[PDB]
Amino acid sequence: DRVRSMTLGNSTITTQESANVVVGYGEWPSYLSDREATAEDQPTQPDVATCRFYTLESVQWEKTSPGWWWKFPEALKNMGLFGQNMHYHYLGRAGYTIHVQCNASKFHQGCLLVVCVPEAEMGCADTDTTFPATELTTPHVFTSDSITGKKVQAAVCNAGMGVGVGNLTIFPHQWINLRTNNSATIVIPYINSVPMDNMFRHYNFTLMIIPFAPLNFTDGATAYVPITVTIAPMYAEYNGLRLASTQ
Amino acid sequence: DRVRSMTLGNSTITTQESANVVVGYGEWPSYLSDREATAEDQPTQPDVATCRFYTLESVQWEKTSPGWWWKFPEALKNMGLFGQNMHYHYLGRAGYTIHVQCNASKFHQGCLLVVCVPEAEMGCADTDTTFPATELTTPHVFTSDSITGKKVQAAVCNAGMGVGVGNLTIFPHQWINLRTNNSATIVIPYINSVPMDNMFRHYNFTLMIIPFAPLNFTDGATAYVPITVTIAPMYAEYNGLRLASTQ
Amino acid sequence: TVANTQPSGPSNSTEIPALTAVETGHTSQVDPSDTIQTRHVVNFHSRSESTIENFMGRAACVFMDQYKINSTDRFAVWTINIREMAQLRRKCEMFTYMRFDIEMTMVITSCQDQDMPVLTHQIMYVPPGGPIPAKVDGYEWQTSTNPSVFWTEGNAPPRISIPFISVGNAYSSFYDGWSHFTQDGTYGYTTLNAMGKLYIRHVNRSSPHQITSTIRVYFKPKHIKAWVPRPPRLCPYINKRDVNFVVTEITDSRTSITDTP
Amino acid sequence: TVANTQPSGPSNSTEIPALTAVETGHTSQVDPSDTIQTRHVVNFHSRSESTIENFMGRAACVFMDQYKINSTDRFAVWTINIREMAQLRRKCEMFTYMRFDIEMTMVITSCQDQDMPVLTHQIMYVPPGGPIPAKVDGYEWQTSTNPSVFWTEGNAPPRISIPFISVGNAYSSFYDGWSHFTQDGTYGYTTLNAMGKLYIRHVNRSSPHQITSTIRVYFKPKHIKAWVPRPPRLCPYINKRDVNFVVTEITDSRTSITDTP
Amino acid sequence: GVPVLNTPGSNQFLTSDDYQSPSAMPQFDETPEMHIPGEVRNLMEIAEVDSVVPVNNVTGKTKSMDAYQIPVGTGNTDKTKPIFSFQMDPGYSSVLKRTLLGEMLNYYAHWSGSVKLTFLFCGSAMATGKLLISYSPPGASVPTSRKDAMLGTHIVWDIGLQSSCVLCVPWISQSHYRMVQQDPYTSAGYITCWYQTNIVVPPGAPTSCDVLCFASACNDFSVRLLRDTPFMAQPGKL
Amino acid sequence: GVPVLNTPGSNQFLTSDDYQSPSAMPQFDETPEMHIPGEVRNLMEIAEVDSVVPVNNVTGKTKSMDAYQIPVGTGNTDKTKPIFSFQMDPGYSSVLKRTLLGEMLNYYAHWSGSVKLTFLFCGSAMATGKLLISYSPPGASVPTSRKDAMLGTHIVWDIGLQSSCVLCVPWISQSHYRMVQQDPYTSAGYITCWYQTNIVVPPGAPTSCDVLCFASACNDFSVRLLRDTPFMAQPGKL
Amino acid sequence: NFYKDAASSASNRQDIQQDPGKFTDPVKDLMIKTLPAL
Amino acid sequence: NFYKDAASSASNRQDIQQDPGKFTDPVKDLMIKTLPAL
Ligand SMILES: CCCCCCCCCCCCCCCC(=O)O
Ligand SMILES: CCCCCCCCCCCCCCCC(=O)O
Ligand SMILES: Nc1nc2[nH]cnc2c(=O)[nH]1
Ligand SMILES: Nc1nc2[nH]cnc2c(=O)[nH]1
Known part of the structure; x- marks a missing residue:
């Protein structure tokens, strides 16, 4: 039960050392029902053009790298037809199979926290101002210090949202322990207070990858150990052309 | 369903381009019932002498004419036997088939609002006095300006009663669009807080004809385009000789 | 609840729901299911709070006046009408005829301009034609058949229910007509407004210092039936005994017909 | 009640309850019956007081402000939010989405900075977009359709119930998103907080001396449904319109990893 | 007698309450009920009635009749320019805040459902044309060309014997209700009109016509949170 | 009317009461209920979820990431010294007062049930070892040797493919509940870790690894007496 | 009902009735949505 | 229930429900306590 495969819309994902996929809060995503809907217009359901695996830019994991975060759905704009249906439609849902994958040898050690946090409302570096939208969205990096300026407070102990970073385990999450698994798959149903929401001005969840045990290896092992994020929306539907x- | 005929008490009305008759608030007028009556005297019901079409004085519709209003039942005094039964009786009901008719060519344009407003309590031109009864009742004309004096405030935007003139569509009304129809027929049941009321000191409704799109035509077309009002009471009954x- | 939206598909036929004629006095009954393609949605939305009982059924201020303790400024008089204050007037001048019975709630707050003992107030209602008091020791105040409320301060506000006391089958917000049969005298709804005066005084005989009380009457219509709706008032409320007005712009202006924020 | 502890004995087998993998996102479901030898004990302990209705269902202070009798300091205004005070904020910023309807209780205590007669207070609530008063003789205060509470001192505190008045299917404690569609303007939960201002004044016209009243609003959530739990707040609450923070230590320190009192 | 306990909220006056109160006039014989035509039992009955929309409310035309009529002409210039354009939210929009839809909507804080815009063409019987009336939900700017406007929910309206057309704005919203006041979170789209082809008129007919606009609610329309209207703005004693 | 008697407690405001109160907005149409994923109905659902425990919270490592990771090495020195040691009571203990178990526990005065400590080994796949994690109830001092610590409820954890182990602290208490605050009458025991054998690593792998700790509640865990949390400590107006 | 008088009663807010047919389409000849108006 | 409105009601403190399975074990493939995790 360590090997697994995920095939979505002409794009399959192969893993051979992995934990089982984690379904966010025990709900698998689906289309919006007729009783919980709000927009009387026929929604667009391009199941194979948008609901497929999209591979983000990989990041280098170093001995002193604090962490990273992406903000979805927005991070998936101008990527395939999933980003084109954002620009032409006003509403949107999805279910985001998140496949974070980071391989190593049996002579590397380290432990990542791949956690999906709904509504990770960040905090500004200077407590009396507001920061631009380019700060929130090459994923932004945390820092193992305290930054100052018109930026998001990207310290690691307070994970940006101002909580204990060890208490991010309450969210749907996995661990990439390099001795056990080299990938972490999280399935996230559409979590929002509203049945459909705009995908640009609203960030439904953020993907935080935080090494609790840092990367370590002796001389001779490969220093370049990249972390690749492969996110695939599921049951995506659009409204409001x-x-x-x-x- | 564009041709229509109305025959009341030896007087018929022929129209060939018209909308269907509008029944005011979905109630057709009738005689007063025995349970909703208040006067224990045998009412006079001259069904053919009074309940017939009476044709008022026609008015010229020009490019800059603001509008007109009549006040009924009073406007129908000294006209036939319907006005004679007003002078001898103290109470009265009716149901007023209102047939406003204005013909043109296919080279004229314009759009009238023929609206019947119950209890169109007018407003005085100078806000601190009261105006005589000859001001209310050749129909009085609106003005596309602001008048001053001991007069009814006959501006058009505030239709005299101090509301938005575009919001007079809530009342029973039709439109005379010169490309579609050349007449507008409104049937008004007896609308009052009382089962019978005196016809002289009380104006049950007023007939406002307001051109929203003004009359327009090039040279050669007939400049004299008159608007004729043909009002016929229905189910009229009288009490209190x-x-x-x-x- | 409101009507659900039925699912529709692509249509190409000789039927035309969008094509109408406004000049028929007819408002088109079309839905978004007739113009575009729609999904089936179940509307659990209700129109429970737009009804006349919920709309009008809130206590609105109708009268404020002062009356002092320790002349004719010693007591208040109102000669009941809705037209004293603008916000409830615009709700009642929205229907031509309306039939309701109201309960009134008084908010009586005494203020000093030496210590007041305690203040007890009397709100006496004389129906039309009754004897009016011209003094606080009037003799009219004893209420043999006039309704009256005695209220001492520091308690709940005095709420009593009133029936539909109109002569006609409904109250008339508007009366396009005259008072006399010769079309003379008072014009408008003032002629119909025959509801008695309301007299408020301190039943305390006197006071060591000048105390000025103010009363606030709050009508809340209930068991409401309204007929013949009419548009809401646009221009303000210059008078109380007549619908007189200065002409005002129908709507706020723009710079161009295309101009939009 | 909570689960009883089943009796276990000495075990020597190829099954391993203690051996887990945290990296599966899975919390082990083991009991002390799996690791050691246990006796049978009947747990009559219940989890009745850890539920969301019992946890959140206590009236917490959300607003304090002064307003004086006898200008704009004559009345108070709140523009309703939970974020005014820290203790109820940390309970509501513990769940991402939560759906509840609240009753509010006011504690109004007048204090003198010559004798006050009696004080009657008005707490008028305008839903968003309504007319705001700029004065005490505003004209806005008459509440034709605004809810309002009149309270004279020396009585029980004014408690009224409020429904779930949000546009969305739940209140959102957090909104990781922008106000405008171009990702511009106001960031955070402020955009979603569209609940009307709350206006409090003395309906007493004046006073012989300066009297300063203070109001204390106590929301108590009831009929509570909460979704998507999130960790409690670590760092303090610098602002009210944004979750901004100074970085703080995660936990109190020790001198050594072995060091213990 | 029976032991009672006074809870909070005693001896208060909540204006929107439902309590029984002692009658001031006991055994009162009310006037017998009579049938008056046109009983309204719900305010959404009188918000679903059409009302002319002052679309041409430019500076200098509001206190007149020219505010209601939309100038539509026959020419070669400015056929790639909108005929009109305004906000779709009927509460704060400076065009349809005063309509019967907007007058009954400003007593409320929340509103839901589809509104529909009816366009009466007030030209001559010989003048024919085609118009594109489009609705575009928010998220982008106002459509500046007819190409960008025909991507929204539009209608191409041929002008003939019927002479009237209904654009049903289909209620494409994220939430179940929208704010009547203007806030970014729940803002309605844009209603623009364009020339599909042109207005074509015979030699002797007047070449300058105008479209008259209407607006009302659909059958799924509802208002949700009572508040006071901002229009009246009493200054003082009457 | 009916004779009543006002008892004590009338006209008071008890904050934790259950009374009915008049609605300010009668006949209000709430937004229809929708299914949002992840409904929490009890706070012991979200105290039974694991959370990383800052065991290495020494001076200078708390405002960092090194607070969570427990240094475990391969050497000849200090193999008769504990790896860590801390109080078992999750309310006042300076190690696990901040965990999700300790955050939801500080809103309460009393607590009952078993807590369990999960230890994730974050070394290489070739490095193997064995560890003794022990719990000793109070009454004696902290165990100072592995001989004294293997007399309590311990577990010898072989480190291999599973790479994770759960020490269930079995709730050995005199009473049914314990105080969340620190008092002598109801004080929990001690959680110490020891080297059972050693960590053995191949020549090329990194010789310094670290164990990552977790803590959550069991299914018989309950909290009993609501109080305010001491953490927030508001200073003044925000 | 604790009082005999009918005016001394609670407001009947619960009932929800409506007849929009007497305002939106008060016409005599029935007009079908599908068919043309004239 | 002395009021018609549902928000004007007592708090439903009595009910006690819980589903900790959607937080502690949200995994797709069922994990038995007895069996090894992988
Ligand atoms: C202390 C006794 C008080 C009795 C007060 C009686 C009040 C009379 C009823 C109120 C009049 C309502 C008139 C409404 C007319 C309209 O709607 O235009
Ligand atoms: C006198 C009338 C008083 C009426 C007061 C109405 C109060 C509005 C409802 C409270 C808003 C609750 C918002 C919670 C949002 C969150 O949980 O973040
Ligand atoms: N393939 C798949 N479909 C579902 N539908 C509901 N749950 C599931 C699931 O777990 N897997
Ligand atoms: N002729 C005629 N008589 C009626 N009696 C009731 N309704 C009607 C109607 O619509 N037409």
């Missing part, structure tokens, strides 16, 4: 937004 | 009133 209009002219394309320039963003 | 006495000597004739001098008004």
Whole structure:
């Protein structure tokens, strides 16, 4: 039960050392029902053009790297037809199979926390101002210090949202322990207070990858150990066609 | 369903381009019932002498004419036997088939609002006095300006009663669009807080004809385009015989 | 609840729901299911709070006046009407005829301009034609058949229920008509407003210092039936005994017909 | 009640309850019956007081402000939010989405900075977009459709119930998103907080001396449904319109990893 | 007698309460009920009635009749320019805040459902045309060309004998209700009109016509949270 | 009317009461209920979820990531010294007062049930070892040798493919509940860790590894007496 | 009902009735949504 | 229930429900306590 495969919309994912997929809060994503819907317009359901695996830019994991975060759905804009249906539609749902994968040898050690946090409302570096939208969204890095300026407070102990970073285990999450597994798959149903929401101005969840045990290896092992994020929306549907937004 | 005919008490009305008749609030007028009556005297019901079409004085519709209003039942005094039964009786009901008719060519344009407003309590031109009864009742004209004096405030935007003139669509009404129809027929049941009321001191409704799109035509078309109002009471009954009133 | 939206598909036929004629006096009954393609959605939305009982059924201030203790400024008089204050007037001048019975709630707050003992107030209602008091020791105040409320301060506000006391089958917000049969005298709804005066005084005989009480009457209509709706008032409320107005713009202006924020 | 402890004995087998893998995102479901030898004990302990209705169902202070009698300091205004005070904020910022309807209780205590007669207070709530008063003789205060509470001192505190008045299917404690569609303007939960202002004043017209009243609003959530739990707040609450923070130690320190008192 | 306990909320006056109170006039004989035509039992009955929309409310035309009529002409210039354009939210929009839909909507804080815009063409019987009336949900800017506007929920309206058309704005919203006041979170789209082809008129007919606009609610329309209207703005004693 | 008697407690405001109160917004139409994933109905659902325990919270490592990781090495020195040691009571203990178990426990005055400590080994796949994690109830001092610590409820944890182990602290208490605050009458025991054998690592693998600790509640865990948390400590107006 | 008088009663807020047919389509000849108006 | 409105009601403190399975073990493949994790 360590080997697993995920095939979505002409893109399959192979893993051979992995924990089983974690279904966020025990709910598998699905299309919006007729009783819980709010928009009387026929939604667009391109199941194979958008609901497929998209591979983000990989990041180098070093001995002193604090962590990273992505903000979805927005991070998936201008990527395939999933980003084109954002610009032309006003509403959207998805279910985001998140496949974070980081391989190593049996002579490397380290432990990542791959956690999906719904509504990770970040905090500004200077407590009396507001920071631009380019700060939130090459994933932004945490820092093992305290930054100052018109930035998101990207310290690691307070994970950006101002909590204990060890208490991020309450969210749907996995661990990549390099002796056990080299990938972590999290399935996230559509979590929001509203049945459909705009995908640009609203970040439904953020993906935080935080090494609790840092990477360590002796001389001779490969120093370049990259972390690759492969996110695939599921059961994505759109509503409210209009002219394309320039963003 | 564009041709229609109305025959009341030896007077018929022919129209060939018209919308269907509008029944005010979905109630057709009738005689007063025995359970909703208040006067224990045998009412006079001259169904053919009074319940017939009476044709008022026609008015010229120009490019800059603001509008007109009549006040009924009173406007129908000294007109036939319907006005004679006002002077000898103290109480009265009716149901007023209102047939406003304005014909044009296919090279004229314009759009009238023929609206019947129950209890169109007008407003005085100078806000601190009261105006005589000859101001309310050749129909009085609106003005596309602001008048001053001991007069009814006959501006058009505030239709005299101090509301938005576009919001007069809540009342029973039709439109005379010169490309579609050349007449507008409104049937008004007896609308009052009381089962019978005196016809002289009380104006049950007023007939407002307001051109939203003004009359327009090039040279050669007929400039004299008159608007004729043909009002016929229905189910009129009277109570309280006495000597004739001098008004 | 409100009507659900039925699912529709692509249509190409000789039927035309969008095509209407406004000049028929007819408002088109079309839904978004007729113009575009829709999904089936179940509307659990209700129209429970737009009803006339929920809309009008809130206590609105209708009268404020002062009356002092320790002349004619010693007591208050109102000659009941809705037209004293603008916000409830615009709700009642929205229907031509409306039939309701109201309960009134008084908020009586005494203020000093030496210590007041305790203040007890009397709100006496004389129906039309009754004897009016011209003094606080009037003799009218004894209420043999006039309804009256005695209230001492520091308690709950005095709420009593009133029936539908109109002569006609409904109250008339508007009366396009005259008072006399010769079309003379008072014009408008003032002629119909025959509801008695309301007299409020301190039943305390006197006071060592000048105390000025103010009363606030709050009508809340209930068991409401309304007929013949009419548009809401646009221009303000210059008078109380007549619908007189200065002409005002129908809507806020823009710079162009295309201009939009 | 909570689960009883089943009796176990000495075990020597190829099954391993203690051996787990945390990296599966899985919390082990083992009991002390799996690791050691246990006796049968009947647990009559219940989890009745750890539920969300019992945890959140206590009236917490959410607003304090002064307003004086006898300008704009004559009345108070709150523009309703939970974020005014820290203790109830940390309970509500513990769940991402939560759906509840609340009753509010006011504690109004007038204090003198010559004798006050009696003080009657008005707490008027305007839903968002309504007319705001800029004065005590505003004209806004008459509450034709605004809810309002009139309270004279020396009585029970004014408690009224409020429904779930949110536009969305739940209140959102956190909103990781922007106000405008171009990702601009206001960031955070402030955008979602559209609940009307709360206006409090003395309905007493004036006073012979300066009287300063203070109001204390106590929300108590009831009929509570909470979704998506999140960790409690570590660092303090610098702002009210944003979750901004100074970085703080995660836990109190020790001198050594073995060091213990 | 029976032991009672006074809870909070005693001896208060909540204006929106439902309590029984002693009658001031006991055994009162009310006037017998009579049938008056046109009983309204719900305010969404009188918000679903059409009302002319002052679309041309430019500076200098509001206190007149020219506010209601939309100028539509026959020419070669400015056929790639909108005929009109305004906000779709009927509460704060400076065009349809005063309609019967907007007057009954400003007593409320929340609103849901589809609104529909009816366009009466007030030209001559010989003048024909085609118009594109489009609705575009928010998220992007206002459509500046007819190409960008025909991507929203539009209708191409041929002008003939019927002479009237209904654009049903289909209620594409994220939430179940929207704020009547103007806030970014719940803002309605844009209603723009364009020339599909042109207005074509015979030699003797007047070449400048105008479209008259209407707006009302659909059958799934509802208002949700009572508040006071901001329009009246009493200054003082009457 | 009916004679009543006002008892004590009338006209008071008890904050934790259960009374009915008049609705400010009568006949309000709430937003229809929707299914949001992850509904929590009890706070012991979210105290039974694991959370990383800052065991290495020495001075200078708390405001960092090194607070969570427990240094475990391969050597000849200090193999008769504990790896860690801390109080078992999750309310006042300076190690696990901040965990999700300790955050939800500090809103309460009394607590009952078994807690369990899960230890994730974050070394290489070739490095193997054995560890003794022991719990000793109070009454004696802290165990100072592995001989004294293997007399309590311990577990010898072989480190291999599973790489994780759960020490269930078995709730050995005199009473049914314990105080969350620190008092002598109801004080929990001690959790010490020892080297059973050693950590053995191949020549090329890194010789310094670290164990990562977890803590959560069992299914028989309950909290009993609501109080305010001491952590927030508001200083003034925000 | 603790009082005999009918005006001394609670407001009947619960009932929800409506007849929008007497305002939106008060016409005599029935007009079908599908068919043309004239 | 002395009021018609549902928000004007007592707090439903009595009910005690819980589903800790959606937080502690949200995994797809069922994990037995007895068996090894992998
Ligand atoms: C102390 C006794 C108080 C009795 C007060 C009686 C109040 C009379 C009823 C109120 C009049 C309502 C008139 C409404 C007319 C309209 O709607 O235009
Ligand atoms: C006198 C009338 C008083 C009416 C007061 C209405 C109060 C509005 C409801 C409270 C808002 C609750 C918002 C919670 C949002 C969150 O949990 O973050
Ligand atoms: N493939 C798949 N479909 C589902 N539908 C509901 N649950 C599931 C699941 O767990 N897996
Ligand atoms: N002729 C005629 N008589 C009626 N009696 C009741 N309704 C009607 C109607 O619509 N037409």
